[PDB]
Structure 1
């Protein structure tokens, strides 16, 4: 079962108008949604309207969907409503800067997949659920949380007056659900490493073809990782504050492991906070930098994401050096 928005919630969203001041702002990659909490659902509607038009979905159905997705995000330190909108905004900026490379169905699917990609996250990693044999890990062997996120997205669409994709043809409805499924699964970081290595191979050899569906799915997969990690592409004070939320969530999981006499990895151990700058250096060098480097190579307009990521890496190097 799913939590449903109240009549007042979606009606309030329907009447919303984005301030003109933010129209130029929202178009940039480094845009931080952080200071505009009350406007987040409205920002999502605005982004949908600019990405695929004002009649892209029935306004009423869209507002119900958005407000219900919001209620099915938990009050965890990081994988919450704020993270969903932040990831959706990064996708909006990638799509706007590469508009015709993607179909109307892909832009529709990807913005919805980004808003739903961590739906009902409990603040626990796939490793934790598998190790402690959680019922969700019994249901899904690999990409446990990601398959749950997709299952929750489908369940929200099935709610009365929430199926934003009902007016698509049977072939189109099936196609968008597959775009959404693969997009959400690709946010499992364990799949990223292999995905990025294959894309680098295809690019260097010159075999990468966006007309080839398998190649297309891999590019979409990398766009998903890039959006999921975009906090590393914001201005340094924003990146720093989000890192506090990221570790608050990891440390809470570590605390749960310590309560059961198990020592967590240093990243999930709050008594190991001095190791954070070196942990971030490793993450930028091994995960974030290659992600945005490959993304810029495939989609040159995404270059500002790589530039901003390199700037934050330098900020982390300064923390390690004592500056």
Structure 2
């Protein structure tokens, strides 16, 4: 923890969302410093009116952002702070440009932004087995989103750390509700759960029966939205997506955790067809203004497929 970094961040001016380009679905962070990503994150909380509605003190929000960033591992090629930051930025764009904000309560928005920023906390890389030391070595197949429970645990620890309590201003009831939504939001990032619930979502939509007013359906939508944001690197402009695919590959093969480009195109096409395309199609139906995520995903499939056919 750099007291210098905190002082620096807390005293800095925070440019507008438009100046920071965070309202753009095509947003990239390659040109940004860590400080710049922290400032963008402050703007996200501010423009979603979370700072006002829940009386967050500036220094506390600043300290919390820095604690979150610090608890991601910089030696992990893809699953690091930049991934979480980008997941949060997609959530912001989906709520604003995507116009999903007016469809949710203030607590759901608050929880979704916190969850997006915290969903992969302390990730050690996909090529590194997550070991649950608190369970028997022969009985470690809970598969009940074990790593995600760990990410949530990390999130709660930071939310409760001295000087980092950004939810201090909520009443006890609001606090319990918010924690519950954050927890379900983080667990939703387990792709296994996404695949398990995909069916309902797609069916409900197929029959114009999707009712966001239904508590069960709304919870379902929040889970789908988290997945859409977690996977959004797949919708980025071509040069950015190539870079992001490169990072994932590195973490997977070169043990960027703690044959290649040649196999990447086929792999991205497969992932787009098996998981991504349908999700963004469904999201666009919920909110047409989310179309650019779908457009971006389709454009990338064609680019990767072309390379797959070897140019």
Alignment partner, residue 271 of structure 2: 283
Superposed CA deviations along residues 174-207 of structure 1, whole A, max 9, x for unmatched, are 0000110000000011111122221011112232
The separation in 2 between residues aligned to 1:184 and 1:136, in whole angstroms, is 21
**Is the Cα contact below 8 Å between 2:127 and 2:257 reproduced in 1?**
no
Which protein has the bigger helix share? 1
Q: Is the 8 A contact 2:249 2:260 kept in 1?
A: no
**Do structure 1's residue 92 and structure 2's residue 92 form an aligned pair?**
yes
- Structure 2 vs 1, CA of residues 219 and 121 (structure 1 numbering), >3 Å: closer, same or farther? same
| Alignment RMSD | 2.3
Greater length-normalized contact order (CA 8 Å, ≥ 6 residues apart): 2
Distance 1:281 1:29 in 2: 21
What TM-score comes out, normalization by structure 1 length?
Answer: 0.87
Aligned to 1:66: 65
Match of 2:232 in 1: 230
SS of aligned partner of 1:28:
coil
3-state secondary structure, aligned to 1:121:
coil
1:123 to 1:255, Cα distance in 2 relative to 1, 3 A: closer
Partner of 1:266: none
- Residue 216 of structure 2 is aligned to residue 214 of structure 1: yes
Structure 1 306/218 Cα, relative in aligned 2: closer, same or farther at 3 Å?
same
The aligned residue for residue 83 of structure 1 is 83
1:292 aligns with 2:289: no
Structure-2 separation of matches of 1:115 and 1:251: 26
Change (3 A) 1:177 1:283: same
Question: 1:7: Cα distance to partner?
Answer: 3.0
Q: Please report how far the alpha carbon of residue 106 of structure 1 lies from its aligned counterpart in structure 2 after TM superposition.
A: 1.1
Q: Distance in 2 between matches of 1:145 and 1:287?
A: 20
Alignment partner, residue 17 of structure 1: 13
Q: 1:211 to 1:15 in 2, by over 3 A?
A: same
8 Å CA contact retained: 2:148, 2:187: yes
Worse overlay, 46-55 or 15-24: 15-24
Find the aligned partners of 2:32 and 2:285 in 1 and give their Cα distance. 33
Q: 1:39 aligns with which of 36, 40, 47?
A: 36
How much has 1:125 moved relative to structure 2? 6.0
Q: Is the 8 A contact 2:284 2:290 kept in 1?
A: yes
Equivalent residues in 2 for 1:1-323, closer than 5 Å = 5-19=1-15, 22-23=18-19, 25-37=21-33, 38-52=35-49, 54-55=51-52, 56=54, 57-75=56-74, 76-96=76-96, 97-124=99-126, 128-129=129-130, 134-135=132-133, 141=142, 142-253=144-255, 271=259, 274-323=262-311
Consecutive unaligned residues in structure 1, runs of 5 or more: 257-270
Which deviates the most, 35-44 or 6-15?
6-15
Q: Relative to 1, partners in 2 of residues 1:104 and 1:134: Cα closer, same or farther, differing over 3 Å?
A: closer
Alignment partner of 1:198: what SS?
helix
Moved more, 92-101 or 76-85: 92-101
- Unaligned ranges ≥5, structure 2: none
Aligned length: 301
| Higher mean displacement: 195-204 or 169-178 | 195-204
